[PDB]
Design a protein around this nucleic acid. Structure first.
Lengths: 328, 74, 93, 80, 97, 104, 105, 93, 97, 78
DNA sequence: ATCGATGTATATATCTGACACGTGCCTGGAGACTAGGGAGTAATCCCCTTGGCGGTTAAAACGCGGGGGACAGCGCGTACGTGCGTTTAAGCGGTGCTAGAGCTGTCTACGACCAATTGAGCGGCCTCGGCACCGGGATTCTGAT
DNA sequence: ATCAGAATCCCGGTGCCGAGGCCGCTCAATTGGTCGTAGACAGCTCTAGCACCGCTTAAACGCACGTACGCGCTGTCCCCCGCGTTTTAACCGCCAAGGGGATTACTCCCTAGTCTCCAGGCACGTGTCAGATATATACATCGAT
C-alpha cells in the first residue's frame, strides 16, 4: 500500500508508503507530491497541458485514493510524453542545471528525505565551533547572481552542516570537485544520506550538478594546510567559531595565493582598515573587504539582516604601501 | 655574478651579488633597494626555498638566473 | 621637582600611525590626562573584583575581565584580543 | 526559547503607567516599552554574567545583580 | 444600568496603585524573559530564585521613573495623552542610547 | 633587555608595575598583569591618534590641536559612549543644526 | 569601662571600624581619632531615619517598621533625598503624586 | 561560619528613639545595607584625600572634611558637631 | 540693504560652531567668582588657571543646556525657547528635585 | 556682578547650542542657573583648600571638584 | 439636584507566624609594651598673585521699526476608555533528581626583599618651520527685481 | 527664476615663536636570590534549582459604544530681530610689590607589632504576641432621574 510517481525521464520511480510521514511543520511528503507534480509540469511543457485539463480543486490529503487520483492521472500522462518523445518531438534537456524554482524543490526534498530529524541538528555544545547554523534560501541564490565561478574555481565550505551551501553552489556552477568539511557530528551523519538522495534526486528530475563530497573530520587538521592553499573560493560562517579558531584559519590563510574570495559573517578585517606600521600583522593588508547586500525583508534575532562580507585576496596594496614609504 | 629576482606581482628587480654570498646578505640587500621587511619576505629558488644563512653556492644558482619572491605575512 | 608624565611614550605611538604629523603642547596635556584617567578606572575595578572573591592578588586575569566590564561592546573585542598576544609574546621571552 | 517579550502583557504596562500618574495612554506605547525594557536588561545581565565567569561558577547569585546595578549607578538596597 | 464617565475609573486606579507595594509584573512570565536574554550570552546558567527577584524589582523602579518623566513632557505640550515622541524625548535628555 | 621589548610594547612596564604598588589597589600584584594592562592603554592611545590624524588633514593642518580631538571623539560612537561625561578644553561642539530651523 | 565604645559614650562598635579601615586597603596607617570620629557620624544618620520612620509609622498605627515607611521617610525629606537620589529601596512604592491638570473639573 | 552585621546595634538605637516600636526583618536588612553604603563613601573618600596630599595617614581631620563634601547642607552641619563631641569625650576620658 | 529677520542668525550659528574661543569675556566672570568665594572664607587667592578651569566648565555646562533646551521647544511645535523649558530640562536630569 | 554677565553673551552661548529664537525672560533665568552652579563647585573647591592648610586655590582644587561632581575635566594636569 | 450603589473606610474576632528573649559557646577587643618613623614646626626661601596706571578700540548699550510668530479658539473626525462575556495560563504544593556549591585538604610555585649595577629619562640648551597675520582674489549665497 | 551684493572662503606673501632635535646627568629599573604563603587541585557533601503536574480561578481578552480630545486651521496682536548711533570698560602693557608657597631641616610622639586575656556577640533554643484573613458594617460619592 504505497504511492508511485512515474519518472518523466525514465529513471527509477520514487515510492512513498502510506501513511505519508511528516518531516517538520511546513514540509511533508503529502504536500511534497503536490509540488512535485507542480514543478515537473514546469519541466515538460506538454505535461503541463495534461494537468490543466480535468484537475479540479477537489482532492485532499486526508483521502488515500484522492491523493492517488491526481497521482494516477500523472502516471497516465507520463506514458503520453514518452510515446511522444519516440516520434518527431525532441526530448527534454537532461544535462542542464536546475533553475532556482526547481532548485527550490530538489534541495528541500533532499533536506526532508535525507535529514529525517532536524531536532538532531540542534544537539550540540553552544559557544563553540560545534554551533549549528544554516543559511537562507535567497542569500546563497544571491551569491549565484553576484559572484562568478568557473572550473579552476573551487567552492569549498568550512563547517558545511548538512552542506546545502555547497549543494546550492555545485548545482549552480561547474567547479571540478567540492569539499564540505564537517567538525559537527550529526549533520555529517545525515550528509551520508544527503549525498545519496541528492545524486538520486538529480536522476529523477534529470538535471546536472557538479562533483561534490560532504566530509567529516577536522578542518583544523594539518592536512588541510595546503588543501586550503589549493582552494579558490572559501565560504565560512565565523559568527561564533571563536577568534583563536579564526586565528588558526588566519594561519591557513597566510598560504593562500591570488584571487581568493572569502564570504564570511564576522569580518576578519575591518571595512575601514588602513595600513600602518602597527597593523603589519593584520589580515586587511592583503584582502579588501566589501559587504554583500544583506537580504531585503530578512530580520535576524538581533534586528539587523545577516551580513556576509565579500573578500578578495589582492596583494596590490601591500607593495604599494612599501613603495609609498619611499615616496616622496 | 648578478642574478634576477622575479616576484608574484610582475615586478622584477635587478640585484647584484657575489656567487659566494648568503641569502641573509641578499635579504639585507633586498631591504636596501626595496625596503620590504625581510622577516616578511619569502624567497624560492625553483622548488628549493632560500634559507637565510645558506649561500648561493649551497644552492648553486647560475649567473643571470631567476628567483621567486613570496610576500609572507608574519 | 622632577615630575613624571607619559609625554614621550605617546609621541612614539604617534609616529607609528602617522610619521608626517606632530602634536602640540596643548593637546599633549589632554593625552597625558587621558591615560592617567583610563588607568584609574581599570585599576579601580581590579580592586573591586579581588575583594568580591576575597582574594588579595591582582592576577592578569582580573584585568581581562575588568576590561570586558568597563569599555563598550565593539572596542573591548580588540583590546582583550590585543592583550592576550602580548602576554603570549611575553611567555616565550 | 523564543519571543517571551510578548509575555509582558498590554494590561501590565497599563498598570505601570497608573503608578506614575498617567491618566491617558495612547496606543503605540505598548510597542515602545517592550523595546525599552529589553535594552535596559541587556546591560544589567551582561555585567552580572561577567562577574559569574570570573568566579568560575555556573550559578548567578543575588550578589551579582547588585554588583551590576551599583556599577551601573542604580544602587539597590535590600538583597545583601 | 449605570456608566462611569470616561476618566473617572483610571483616577481611582492611580489612588489605588500608588499605595500598594506588590510587584505589578507577574512572577513567571518575567522569568521566562530573563532566561531568554541570558541564553544568548552564556548557555547553561542557573539563576538563584532571589536573583530573579532582583531583576524584577529594579526593572519596575526604572520604568516607573520613565513614566513620571514621560508625564512631565505631555503636560508640557498641553496634552494629556502620552505619545512615543515623549519617551524618545526623555531618554535623549537623560543621555541614554 | 627591557621588558617592553621582550613583549613588543611601546608603553613602559616599569612605570605601570610601580603604580599598582603605590596605589594600594591590592596587596600583591601578579607578574604578567602590568604587561596586560600596558597592552590596552597602547591600543586606546593608538585609537585616538588614529581618529585624530584623519580629521586633522581636513583643516589642512600639520599638528594636532584640541579641536581635532573633540572632532575625533564625538564622531566615533564607541569612544563617545566611553567618554560621555568628560568635557575637553578648547573643544567646541560638532557642526550640527536642527531640521526645522532650515528655511524654505 | 574597658570598651572603647563606652569610654566615648557611643553605641556603634569602635573596635570593629578600626578593623575595617585596615583590611580594606583604604590607607596604610590609621590615626587614633579616625574610628571614633567616624562611628559617631554613622550613629547620627541611622538615628535620623528611625526617628522619621517612627513618625510615619505611628500615623499608620502599626507596631513595626515596614519598608513602605522608610520610602516615605526619605522621599518626604529635603536633605535625605539629595543623598539618596541614587537608591532603589526594595518593595518600597512611590509617593502619592498627581499632577495639576489631571484632577477632575 | 561567622557572618557579621550591624543588626544588634540598631535595636539599641531604635529603642532610644521610639521605645514602643519594633522593626521587621525585611526593613532590618535595608538598614544593614545602608550603613555599609555610607561607610564606603566616607572611608572611600579619605583614600583620596590621603593621596591627594601625598600622605599616608587618616586622622580625624580627613574624616571631618570627608563629611563636608558628601552630606548636604543642614545635615553636614550637625554631623561634624556630633562627631567632634565624641572625640573630646574620648579625649578627656 | 536689508536682511530678512532670522537670516543673520543662521549665519551666527555657523560662525560659532566652527570656533573655539571663550564666549564670556575674562574680566567680569573673574569678578563674579571672587564674590561667591567671599561668602565661604575671606582672603582667598586664585591662581590664574584656577579661574580658567571654571570658565571651561561654566560655558561647557551652559552650552550643553541649550542643546537640551532646544530639543524641548521643537517638541512643543515652537521655535522660541522660554523659561518653562530650562525649568523642564533641568528637572528631567534630576539636577533639580 | 551677575549683572555683568551681559545680554549678548548669553545670546552668544545660545547660538553655539543651535538656538534660533530667544525670548526675553531667559536673561534672568540663565543668570540664575549659573549662580547656583558655582556654589556647588567653589564650596567643594574651598573645602580642599581648607584641608591643605593653604589660602591659594590652585588649579587642581577646581579639577578635583569637577571629578567628584561627575563632570570630569581633561587638560589641566589630572 | 438627591437615589444608589458602588467602592472604600473601619471594625469585628482568631489562628498563624514572626519576632523577642536565653544558652552557651568562640574569635575578636582590649592591655600593654616595645621600636621606629612619619609628621610638626621652624627657617628661608624666590616665585607669582594683587594692584593700579593709561590709552586704545571693540563691544556693549540705546532705540525703533516691521512682521513673523505665539496665542485662543473652532471644528470635526476619530481613537481610547468602560464594560460583559470568554478563555488560557499562572499559581499552588507536590515530589523527586542531581548537579554543583561550598568547605577542607595539602602541598608549592610564585612573588617579595635585599642588595648590585647602569642605562633610560628628564631638565636645560638651541632652532627651525608652521601658522599667524596680511591684504588680495574668486566664490557663494540674499534679496529685490 | 535672474539678477545683484556683500561675505567669506582662500591665498600669496612673510614674521614671530614654539616644537622638534641635542646635551647630559641621575635615579629608578633589572639583576640575582633566596623564601614563605597564598593559591590550586582534590575530594566530599548536601543544598535547592530544576523538572514536573494536576486543580481551581483570577486574569487577559475580544468587542461594541461613544465621547471627549488630538489636530488642523485662522488670525490677530505684538514681541524679537536688524540696523544704526553713542558710550564704557575691557585689554594690553605695565611695573612694583611681598606674601605665601615650596623645599630643608630636626626630632618627637604616635602607630604597629606581639604576646596575652576574656567576654561580648553569635547561633540555636523555646515561647509569644502582632498580624492577616474572613467577614461585617460605615461612608460617601459619583452620575443619572
Amino acid at each position: 500500500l504505497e504511492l508511485r510517481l512515474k519518472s518523466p525521464v525514465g529513471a527509477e520511480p520514487a515510492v512513498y508508503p502510506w501513511p505519508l510521514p511528516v518531516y517538520d511543520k511546513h514540509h511533508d511528503a503529502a504536500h511534497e507530491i503536490i509540488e512535485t507534480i507542480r514543478w515537473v509540469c514546469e519541466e515538460i511543457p506538454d505535461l503541463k497541458l495534461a494537468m490543466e485539463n480535468y484537475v479540479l480543486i477537489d482532492y485532499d490529503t486526508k483521502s488515500f485514493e484522492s491523493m492517488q487520483r491526481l497521482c494516477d492521472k500523472y502516471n497516465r500522462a507520463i506514458d503520453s510524453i514518452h510515446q511522444l518523445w519516440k516520434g518527431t518531438t525532441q526530448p527534454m534537456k537532461l544535462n542542464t542545471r536546475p533553475s532556482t524554482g526547481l532548485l527550490r524543490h530538489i534541495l528541500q526534498q533532499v533536506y526532508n528525505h535525507s535529514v529525517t530529524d532536524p531536532e538532531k541538528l540542534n544537539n550540540y555544545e553552544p559557544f563553540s565551533p560545534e554551533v549549528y547554523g544554516e543559511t537562507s534560501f535567497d542569500l546563497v541564490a544571491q551569491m549565484i547572481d553576484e559572484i562568478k565561478m568557473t572550473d579552476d574555481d573551487l567552492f569549498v565550505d568550512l563547517g558545511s552542516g548538512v552542506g546545502q551551501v555547497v549543494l546550492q553552489v555545485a548545482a549552480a556552477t561547474n567547479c571540478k570537485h567540492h569539499y564540505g568539511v564537517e567538525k559537527a557530528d550529526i549533520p555529517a551523519k545525515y550528509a551520508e544520506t544527503m549525498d545519496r538522495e541528492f545524486r538520486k534526486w538529480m536522476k529523477w528530475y534529470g538535471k546536472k550538478h557538479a562533483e561534490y563530497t560532504l566530509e567529516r573530520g577536522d578542518f583544523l587538521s594539518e592536512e588541510w594546510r595546503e588543501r586550503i592553499a589549493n582552494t579558490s573560493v572559501i565560504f565560512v560562517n565565523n559568527f561564533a567559531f571563536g577568534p583563536e579558531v579564526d586565528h588558526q584559519l588566519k594561519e591557513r590563510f597566510a598560504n593562500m595565493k591570488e584571487g581568493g574570495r572569502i564570504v564570511s559573517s564576522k569580518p576578519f578585517a575591518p571595512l575601514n582598515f588602513r595600513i600602518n606600521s602597527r597593523n603589519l600583522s593584520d589580515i586587511g593588508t592583503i584582502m579588501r573587504v566589501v559587504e554583500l547586500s544583506p537580504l531585503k525583508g530578512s530580520v535576524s534575532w538581533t534586528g539587523k539582516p545577516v551580513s556576509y562580507y565579500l573578500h578578495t585576496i589582492d596583494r596590490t596594496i601591500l607593495e604599494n604601501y612599501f613603495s609609498s614609504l619611499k615616496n616622496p | 655574478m648578478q642574478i634576477f629576482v622575479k616576484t608574484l606581482t610582475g615586478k622584477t628587480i635587478t640585484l647584484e651579488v657575489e656567487p659566494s654570498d648568503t641569502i641573509e646578505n641578499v635579504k639585507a640587500k633586498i631591504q636596501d633597494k626595496e625596503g620590504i621587511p625581510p622577516d616578511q619576505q619569502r624567497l624560492i629558488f625553483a622548488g628549493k626555498q632560500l634559507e637565510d644563512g645558506r649561500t648561493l653556492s649551497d644552492y648553486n644558482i647560475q649567473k643571470e638566473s631567476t628567483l621567486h619572491l613570496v610576500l609572507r605575512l608574519r | 621637582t622632577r615630575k613624571e608624565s607619559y609625554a614621550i611614550y605617546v609621541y612614539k605611538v604617534l609616529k607609528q600611525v602617522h610619521p608626517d604629523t606632530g602634536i602640540s603642547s596643548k593637546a599633549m596635556s589632554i593625552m597625558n590626562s587621558f591615560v592617567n584617567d583610563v588607568f584609574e578606572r581599570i585599576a579601580g575595578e581590579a580592586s573591586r573584583l579581588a575583594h568580591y572573591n576575597k582574594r588579595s592578588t591582582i592576577t592578569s586575569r582580573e584585568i581581562q575581565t575588568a576590561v570586558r566590564l568597563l569599555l563598550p561592546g565593539e572596542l573591548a573585542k580588540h583590546a582583550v584580543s590585543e592583550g592576550t598576544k602580548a602576554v603570549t609574546c611575553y611567555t616565550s621571552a | 526559547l523564543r519571543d517571551n517579550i510578548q509575555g509582558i502583557t498590554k494590561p501590565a504596562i497599563r498598570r505601570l503607567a497608573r503608578r506614575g500618574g498617567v491618566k491617558r495612554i495612547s496606543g503605540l506605547i505598548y510597542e515602545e516599552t517592550r523595546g525599552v525594557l529589553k535594552v535596559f536588561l541587556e546591560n544589567v545581565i551582561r555585567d552580572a554574567v561577567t562577574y559569574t565567569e570570573h568566579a568560575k561558577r555556573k550559578t548567578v547569585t543575588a550578589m551579582d545583580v547588585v554588583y551590576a546595578l551599583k556599577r551601573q549607578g542604580r544602587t539597590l538596597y535590600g538583597f545583601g | 444600568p449605570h456608566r462611569y464617565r470616561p476618566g473617572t475609573v483610571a483616577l481611582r486606579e492611580i489612588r489605588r496603585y500608588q499605595k500598594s507595594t506588590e510587584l505589578l509584573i507577574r512572577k513567571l512570565p518575567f522569568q521566562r524573559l530573563v532566561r531568554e536574554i541570558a541564553q544568548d550570552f552564556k548557555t547553561d546558567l542557573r539563576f538563584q530564585s532571589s536573583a530573579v527577584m532582583a531583576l524584577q524589582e529594579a526593572s519596575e523602579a526604572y520604568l516607573v521613573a520613565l513614566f513620571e518623566d514621560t508625564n512631565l513632557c505631555a503636560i508640557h505640550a498641553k496634552r494629556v495623552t502620552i505619545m512615543p515622541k515623549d519617551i524618545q524625548l526623555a531618554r535623549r535628555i537623560r543621555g541614554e542610547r | 633587555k627591557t621588558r617592553s621589548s621582550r613583549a613588543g610594547l611601546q608603553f613602559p612596564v616599569g612605570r605601570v608595575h610601580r603604580l599598582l604598588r603605590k596605589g594600594n589597589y591590592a596587596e600583591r600584584v601578579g607578574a604578567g598583569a602590568p604587561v596586560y594592562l600596558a597592552a590596552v592603554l597602547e591600543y586606546l592611545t593608538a585609537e585616538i591618534l588614529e581618529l585624530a590624524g584623519n580629521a586633522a588633514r581636513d583643516n589642512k593642518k600639520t599638528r594636532i590641536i584640541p579641536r581635532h580631538l573633540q572632532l575625533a571623539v564625538r564622531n566615533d560612537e564607541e569612544l563617545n559612549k566611553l567618554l560621555g561625561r568628560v568635557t575637553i578644553a578648547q573643544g567646541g561642539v560638532l557642526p550640527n543644526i536642527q531640521s526645522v530651523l532650515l528655511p524654505k
